[PDB]
Ligand binder design. Structure first.
Ligand SMILES: CCC[C@@H](Cc1ccc(OC)c(CNC(=O)c2ccc(C(F)(F)F)cc2)c1)C(=O)O
Lengths: 246, 261
């Protein structure tokens, strides 16, 4: 048992590294100790950042969308490396990605966040929490709850090897609506959960019940996603091919 | 056997086939099974005249109604193609303006490539394969509507002789989207680097899938000139329609695609 699992963990770490350029380890190095990122903390600072790297709030939102669309392709590539994933019914793969990417985006965004701001543009920029929060409604309230989640998530002190398995657990959720064959999805998730548990026991022997605590974070994640989607709807009180891409 | 480099190309081929099946709900495989009688469950209702057309409805003017139907389907196809385009590695990382440009010039060449899958020399599948409208009925519509589809049929018959399957088409459609010689492109190099890779993958795919088909790769690439000619002829036909039929509406997505094409 405890060998297929080590294999699974290593396999997923290696694939996570290929798929996601900006790892947590590299993000934390930048957020602390070498060559500093460009800090966007103001309206004038944002203006200059676009030279270095509609009005203002709209351009920032549209930027997050371009990045999210990129991230969806990175996550999809990652998914296809999870053993058993490509052997699932194709409708079910599409369903799992459709309902999983938002949860994964915000999980991974926490790797680029501290309590004072978030890394952007592959770590070249840093947009402050206070700047994002100052944006006029409804655009001032879209990142804040991701910051509150991130602070709580980051207290677990997970590393990229832990996160690789956790992301996979998220993708293989058998409770997504419209799934046709739930059995093999839950069978794969069981194996991934086993791998995650062992990974966290070996990697974090002094953090009691880290496995449990990580799983409980799924509750705040789905909350964040549901309220985000409702903000996206409210956004409909504010180029044809361009809107098609998004 | 295969080597590391040709192995990466196979993975690319498989990724693109997989995304094609997820993005396009009516494949060539399904279209051929409907057209060739692999069926008591999948046979289409045939529209060959006005009364057939009437009877087909439970499933103004006839020429305009069919034309409005094509427009609508064209808008759907653009949505499907745009979703496919996102899956092509590197595409979403390109400059946003270039993504729009590649789609603008790409989508119709792709629409007509895939339309061939739904066609034989006698007609075309419609309404997700539930109906089949004859080439003769379409050709009989009052001018200039009777001219719209004939060039698509001529191309299709010649294109279908290549006997490409969906795994082949998936890489070819990607090659179409990622052309660095589209007008107005800001950053050509990254586009060409992606197409290089796509071309290598198409080439190997055609060698493996059709080993007895000499220069299929070259012959398929040559067909890109036919697609371009179809697009241009089609656009000149729409300008005539827009002027003779002041009461007919062209969808803004389609209008933006054609704007200064
Ligand atoms: C004016 C609209 C013409 C299109 C070109 C076009 C796009 C898609 C097409 O179908 C895949 C076609 C050919 N039309 C059909 O196959 C078709 C015909 C009738 C119907 C309908 F009757 F069901 F509506 C649906 C599709 C043309 C364009 O210029 O964008």
């Amino acid at each position: 048992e405890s060998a297929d699992l080590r294999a699974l963990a290593k396999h997923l770490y290696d694939s996570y590294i290929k798929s996601f350029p900006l790892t947590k380890a590299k993000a934390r190095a930048i957020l602390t100790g070498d060559k500093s990122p460009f800090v966007i903390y103001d309206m004038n600072s944002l203006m200059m950042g676009e030279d270095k790297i509609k009005e203002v709030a709209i351009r920032i939102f549209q930027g997050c969308q371009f990045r999210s669309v990129e991230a969806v392709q990175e996550i999809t590539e990652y998914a296809k490396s999870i053993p058993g994933f490509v052997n699932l019914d194709l409708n079910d793969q599409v369903t799992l990605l459709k309902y999983g990417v938002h949860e994964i985006i915000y999980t991974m965004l926490a790797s680029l966040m501290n309590k004072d701001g978030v890394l952007i543009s592959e770590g070249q920029g840093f947009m402050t929490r206070e700047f994002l929060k100052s944006l006029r409604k409804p655009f001032g309230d879209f990142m804040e709850p991701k910051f509150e989640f991130a602070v709580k998530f980051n207290a677990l002190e997970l590393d990229d090897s832990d996160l690789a398995i956790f992301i996979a657990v998220i993708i293989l959720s058998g409770d997504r609506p419209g799934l046709l064959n739930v059995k093999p999805i839950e069978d794969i998730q069981d194996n991934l959960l086993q791998a995650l548990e062992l990974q966290l026991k070996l990697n974090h022997p002094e953090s009691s019940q880290l496995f449990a605590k990580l799983l409980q974070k799924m509750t705040d994640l789905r909350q964040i996603v549901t309220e985000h989607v409702q903000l996206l709807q409210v956004i409909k009180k504010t180029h044809p091919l361009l809107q098609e891409i998004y």
